[PDB]
Symmetry: none
């Protein structure tokens, strides 16, 4: 059916290499098929202008794609006097997402920096980033508990995301890759929690348009994949967090 | 209930001033409550690099917000050596949307430029722009038919959009304004066709998160509003297009 | 004689729509023939680096021309990594002009932002902008008096401007439009006060060159038109300012 | 009367060092009192987008002021992510001016680059630049004739400029310097041809305003000075151009 | 002695993970202590303007440092409208270096892109990059031979680099890290070949200054370390290149 | 032997015109053969962020090359939205160098701005700049002593630099020019003090590579030239500094 040889509702092989990079408090290298992203979580007692003594913590994220992470070498973002739209659109998405499952108050007035740097791109880097950004943030926060830097665990749920779409001649597809995301008529990112609720939904029909029926199809497929992801997420994380 | 004094499922008053600006082939000034956007459609026999002799036409759009279109004067985008993220995120959305209802082949190898410049902002400028950008594009194409510059009408459907959201203490709301969009927990733009199908769906829960139930609520409300919009769209357009 | 069907010393029809845009303290939509400019005045207690506690106020202005405001769609200035020369040359002119008739000391240490955004261009947008920028600034300051935010009226005179030129086969022309400004041998912007004095004079002979005689001809014509403008300016403003 | 010890209608001492810098086709170091500008003319067979095969040549100019060319060290323009307004306003003025006395057609489809870099500033750098930019351009074109790269001499006249103004307690002054231009009520740049015609007139009353009488005064003084300049211009240029 | 617990002439532990990233023809992840750099080599039949049909190949390189690769999160280079000096200074160094050991003629008219992206920085990233950039380039070229895309092996030698310096109270140090490079009086990068010759020497005494004696000390130490590096380089590369 | 007709170990004729430009505290026009650089030193009681009340002074430098300072007109750096690499690489070098011979503490909490603007380039502009930048800085500081603005002389040594290299068929060459630096196999800048110590060493073998023997050759030649430079430096400076 599909050129990977996977069923329409099958995720790509996932691997989670923990503590990939020494320095960061939380570091995970998520591999989803050929998509590889380095997710690092860094803590730092400090907050932007509007959180002064608010006893509320923050979570921001930066996302980049190495020039030859893609099939064709894309111009380094630094070369251009500005950060591209995608990077912009994506960085906010990752931060917005992670915050939805963390008690910013219980975290303290500290700030968590999430750096998602894609070293190999083959579709679904946006979502793959969120999935691994969580694990990393968890580990960073998990070991923040140990050293007694916070008394309670701020994480109020598991988080994960996955792309899904419709291919003119194959229908619904779970977890697209560059090939698929490139020719699909309806691209669609879905981000949920362990408790099966939605954090964010972003669907766009570039070629054609979808119906209430199509939608419910994609949502159902995505939900299935995300649960599959959160499981793998639970075993791996295991002890790092109570 | 709401400070406009409108019901939970009532649109703001809409007005369509046609031919607002002489010069452009298509020009419409859409007014949605206090939101006012100037939508101009310009034709131009030419295409980007990848449409050379492809017999395929294009549709691109640029969106700007005059500095004091907002309650607080925002720095002119030109002043900054770069175009902001929103503008970026929005310009693509408008173009992507319009293309979903136009047979780029039947249009020819010409290019349609859509300029949506907001002169007064009070919420839902993104959607209001798409709604009026259509009308303008229709008129431009409509009169392109007359002069026999194309033999068949490329427009394959009507297009419109509308914001919808959830207010902590009021629930579902159709067509938010700046105050509402500002305090809503779940923002959500919806773009559909006359045939009741989806072109794009963008929903984000900044404060909290939504459920499959909430979603189906919003979608249902949006759908209702959009149909209401396409009607007004049909009478006004009337003859300009066959 | 002239295609508008107007005499060499006749101004184009002028209209002043006050309070066009809700948000700004001062907002005027000046229409001069087919030239339409949105002039907004915004107050803001603050000053650049060199006015710290100087008890002196400031007045700066930004000018833009919507992409399809012109007969041919010009590339959006934001698209280019820089602001064009004209815009530059013009923004400074408007600010310089307005300041020449305002007691920056009596104004206070606040700052007035003038945004002149041309929505339809057909010649003399530079001057039309100044003419309307004044009215807007007047209204903003006028209502700044009421609320007792300043004790005395800073405006020390009326201000207005108008283009004038020489056409190879028609001679002196008052208030050119795109067609005329385009083929005239001698373009020339003139900015004066109610008291009949000059604030700025900018004359350039692109094709040929002019003589002391020609000059005195243009200046005399311009002066006539400007007085005509300041009258219309007086009735309209009327009460908004003491 | 004046600190320099010069009469109201006396120019500052002028010197023209030809071929100052080896590399450029035309190079002149103009010294006007304490104002020193390096004017270089560079030829280059090529034209911008709109002169392709038009058989029409171009003339553009860039102007800069070395950081400590002024009494106080001004921030390098490169340091700022943008070119200042003055530089902008001035670069265009120089190019516009030179073009007014050159048959762009007879020049060919080549392009002349004029670089006016001020190494010591003490007033009237804008005008001094034009005066010397001409000489340089003349020499470049003059020796372009010799090598038979063009058959006819494109220069259709001599060009020069000079500042003039009014001092509250001294009246009309010819060729101001930094201290005079700084306290004058009416600044005013005048650019003319050998044939005594005007190319550009730029007058501004910052403090006060001027009358038709004042104007005719300044114009008359400027004209006198410019003729004086074109003479010095004729002997020096001498043979370099037929 | 030193905080790593290593002798003054001991290198940090080095590891070479080959084929780290699938996509690039050559991909190596060099780890030097805590410094980790992803070195990717990409081939591409094409050359800049001045190598058209010259039968000469090229080698260019881009270098970046992920925002939180450093102990403190540095602003993304893309965020700034420009690429920093270091990046500039470094990118050229890497390219210049690699070219010194490759017969650009035997390579063909193709172009090799080297992307050195540092994912974890702890000193000597500049040099570590060159050392790994070679290995990657070797592999890319090595497998270019196999597929018979070139008949002869262009690499004319092995290349490697290493930092060295002087610490106020410890003397000569081989292979500094962030801590050491930060407090050393004399920083100094050295790049040599297998044949023990110099390709580039860059030494700078920020605090103090060095003597002919000091220099010969550093050079001798560096040379020792580099040879050590080229060995590890030989075994790892092993067969990938004849 | 060499086109100039100078021996392999002969410097180009050097001239030092003091007080070239009135305004700056220190101003020197260094001429090395055909290379001409304007070196200006400007004092300014103030320091960047990290020197607040530190009683430590600073020294920064900016370097530019006028567009037609070179044989071919290079694009103005301002035209490009960024400062080139060379300029970057060089500006830092000059500042770094000068600081190595000045007791920043004895200087005070003031800041010295060095502007090296090349008006005619023919090789060795980088070094020529440092050589003259010193003289200028000396004079600025020298006359800072007189007016008793500082009690002790901060300059702890003389500074100078010179390029040196190897020509495929001529060997070692002292003080290259554009032609020589262009075809040399080994370029190499050397910066030393009067006390014969090294401040910075930058050597690069673009074509080939050099050996310990070659190196010691160049270093020995450079050292010879630099001493020759510091002498000329001593007489000229003479009294300006104790």
């Amino acid at each position: 059916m599909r050129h990977d040889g996977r069923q329409h509702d099958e995720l790509r092989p996932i691997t989670f290499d923990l503590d990939f990079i020494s320095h960061p408090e939380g570091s995970v290298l998520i591999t989803a098929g050929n998509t590889k992203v380095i997710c690092n979580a860094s803590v730092e007692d400090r907050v932007p202008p509007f959180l002064r003594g608010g006893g509320k913590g923050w979570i921001t994220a930066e996302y980049s794609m190495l020039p030859r992470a893609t099939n064709q070498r894309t111009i380094r973002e630094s070369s251009k006097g500005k950060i591209s739209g995608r990077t912009m659109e994506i960085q906010r998405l990752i931060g917005r997402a992670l915050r939805a499952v963390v008690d910013l108050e219980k975290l303290g007035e500290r700030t968590i920096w999430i750096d998602c740097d894609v070293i190999q791109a083959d579709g679904g880097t946006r979502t793959a980033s969120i999935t691994g950004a969580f694990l990393a943030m968890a580990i960073a926060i998990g070991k923040l508990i140990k050293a007694g830097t916070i008394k309670t665990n701020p994480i109020t749920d598991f988080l994960a995301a996955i792309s899904v779409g419709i291919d003119k001649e194959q229908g619904i597809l779970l977890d697209l890759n560059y090939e698929e995301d490139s020719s699909a008529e309806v691209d669609m990112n879905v981000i949920m929690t362990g408790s099966g609720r939605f954090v964010e939904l972003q669907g766009t029909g570039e070629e054609a348009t979808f119906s209430r029926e199509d939608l419910n199809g994609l949502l159902g497929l995505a939900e299935k994949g995300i649960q599959e992801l959160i499981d793998k997420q639970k075993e791996v994380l295991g002890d790092s967090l109570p």
